[PDB]
């Protein structure tokens, strides 16, 4: 057909198989989750969006899945990210120094996927799904990440780290999901510091991006929540990963 219902990409192909296989694999690798019944996980995941209008999804819709995907992560080793997931993943993969949301079962299940259903049919919509801007914010994908993100941020303690894309027009974007959900769900009772790592996109010699107006804004927001703020430039992400891999044996 020549025009879809919604403005965004449709459900990722073979969504049900893909999720179930991810669950099986995750629960094989991670002993803490060994027990989890993946079929129950798929049923709860399905239950959140199937037969529901995909502009009328709620955090409650995901509660059965949230319950099944309950999981402890070391609260003091959390790595958040904004618009720079790939480096965050490359980093934690070296020796599991920190944990991103994609290191949890629910994050791993949904990473890079799109999904939505239809009001009053129980079919998965493989043709289109709502775009967060053009169509609706309360869509299955966006609501999932908000709900799961909030719980992950709420669990953090001590020093929480965040990678930010220093190549972007706004290094910290107050209106990003990171800025609108994660930042505001850190618990001041538990979190001592948020430390931002500003990832330079620019070759060689660049600015102290910890001085960027948007970084000062982040610092102000965080500080006003009674959490300390720290910031570091990562000038060369390639050299950084090399140093993480081969710590100070080398020019690190
Ligand atoms: C909480 O925030 C970070 C993402 O923060 P960003 O500033 O990168 O968010 P933004 O660009 O405004 O929006 C990205 C949206 O993508 C969805 N999403 C989050 N995480 C994933 C993964 N792993 N795969 C695909 N899509 C993802 C959400 O709908 C965001 O709204 C995340 O760690 C948490 F979402």
Q: Which atom of ligand 1 is nearest to the CA of 176?
A: 12
DSSP per-residue string spanning 144-178: HHHHHHHHHHHH--EEEEEEEETTSSSSS-TTSHI
Q: Does the C-beta of 177 come closer than 6 Å to ligand 1?
A: yes
* Active-site annotation holder among 116, 157, 210, 252: 157
What residues have CB less than 8 Å from 165, skipping those under 6 apart?
82, 83, 84, 171, 199, 201
Cα 6 vs. chain centroid, distance in angstroms?
Answer: 24
What residues have CB less than 8 Å from 138, skipping those under 6 apart?
55, 56, 57, 58
Q: In angstroms, what is the span from residue 145 Cα to ligand 1's centroid?
A: 7
Positive or negative, the CA dihedral 126, 19, 120, 65 is: negative
**Which tokens sit at 176?**
């990003």
Confirm if 62 and 141 have CB atoms less than 8 A apart.
no
CA distances from 206 to 81, 187, 188, 202, 244 (A): 21, 34, 33, 7, 22
CATH superfamily assigned to domain 73-99+156-252 = NAD(P)-binding Rossmann-like Domain (3.40.50.720)
75 is catalytic: yes
Resolution of the structure, angstroms: 1.8
For 138-156, letters b (16+ CB in 10 Å) and e give bbbbbbbbbbbbbbbbebb
Helices 85-95 and 237-245, packing angle to 10 deg: 10
As a whole number of angstroms, the distance between CA 182 and CA 79 comes to: 11
Q: Does the C-beta of 111 come closer than 6 Å to ligand 1?
A: yes
Question: Residue 39: how many CB atoms within 10 A of its CB?
Answer: 11
For a mutational test of ligand 1's pocket, the pick from 177, 183, 184, 198, i.e. the residue with the most ligand atoms closer than 8 A to its C-beta, is: 177
Cα 131 vs. chain centroid, distance in angstroms?
Answer: 18
The H-assigned helical ranges of the chain are 15-29, 38-49, 63-68, 85-95, 105-110, 140-155, 177, 183-185, 213-224, 237-245
**Which tokens sit at 252?**
């690190």
Positive or negative, the CA dihedral 104, 107, 109, 111 is: negative
Domain ranges of the chain: 1-72+100-155, 73-99+156-252
Q: In angstroms, what is the span from residue 148 Cα to ligand 1's centroid?
A: 11
Q: Counting beta carbons within 10 angstroms of the beta carbon of residue 123, is it exposed (0 to 12), middle (13 to 18) or buried (19 or more)? A: exposed
Q: Read off φ and ψ for residue 234, nearest 5 degrees.
A: -110, 100
Q: Does the C-beta of 61 come closer than 6 Å to ligand 1?
A: no
Q: Counting beta carbons within 10 angstroms of the beta carbon of residue 106, is it exposed (0 to 12), middle (13 to 18) or buried (19 or more)? A: buried
Task: Report the structure determination method.
Answer: X-ray
Q: Is 90 helix (H, G, I), strand (E, B) or coil?
A: helix
210 is catalytic: no
**Which tokens sit at 106?**
């629910």
What residues have CB less than 8 Å from 49, skipping those under 6 apart?
57, 61, 115, 116, 117, 140
Intrachain domains 1-72+100-155 and 73-99+156-252 with the same fold: no
Confirm if 79 and 161 have CB atoms less than 8 A apart.
yes
Fold of 1-72+100-155: ADP Ribosyl Cyclase; Chain A, domain 1 (1.20.82)
Q: In angstroms, what is the span from residue 147 Cα to ligand 1's centroid?
A: 11
CA distances from 70 to 148, 151, 152, 213, 234 (A): 10, 10, 10, 38, 33
Residue 246 falls in which region: left (phi positive, over 0), alpha (psi -120 to 50) or beta:
beta
Q: Which atom of ligand 1 is nearest to the CA of 107?
A: 23
Residue 41 falls in which region: left (phi positive, over 0), alpha (psi -120 to 50) or beta:
alpha
């Amino acid at each position: 057909r020549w025009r879809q219902t919604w403005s965004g990409p449709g459900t990722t192909k073979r969504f049900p198989e893909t999720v179930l296989a991810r669950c099986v694999k995750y629960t094989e690798i991670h002993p803490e989750m060994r027990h989890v019944d993946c079929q129950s996980v798929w049923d709860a995941f399905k239950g959140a969006f199937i037969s529901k209008h995909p502009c009328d999804i709620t955090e409650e819709d995901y509660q059965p899945l949230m319950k099944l995907g309950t999981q402890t992560v070391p609260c003091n080793k959390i790595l958040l990210w904004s618009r720079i997931k790939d480096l965050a993943h490359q980093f934690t993969q070296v020796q599991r120094d920190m944990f991103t949301l994609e290191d949890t079962l629910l994050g791993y299940l949904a990473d890079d996927l799109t999904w939505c259903g239809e009001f009053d049919t129980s079919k998965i919509n493989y043709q289109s799904c709502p775009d967060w801007r053009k169509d609706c914010s309360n869509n299955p994908v966006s609501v999932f990440w908000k709900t799961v993100s909030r719980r992950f941020a709420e669990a953090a303690c001590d020093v929480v780290h965040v990678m930010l894309d220093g190549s972007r027009s706004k290094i910290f974007d107050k209106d990003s999901t990171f800025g609108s959900v994660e930042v505001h769900n850190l618990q001041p009772e538990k979190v001592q510091t948020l430390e931002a790592w500003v990832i330079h996109g620019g070759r060689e010699d660049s600015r102290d991006l910890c001085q960027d107006p948007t970084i000062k804004e982040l610092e102000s927001i965080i500080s006003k929540r009674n959490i300390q703020f720290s910031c570091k430039n990562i000038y060369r992400p390639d050299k950084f990963l090399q140093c993480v891999k081969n710590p100070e044996d080398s020019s690190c």
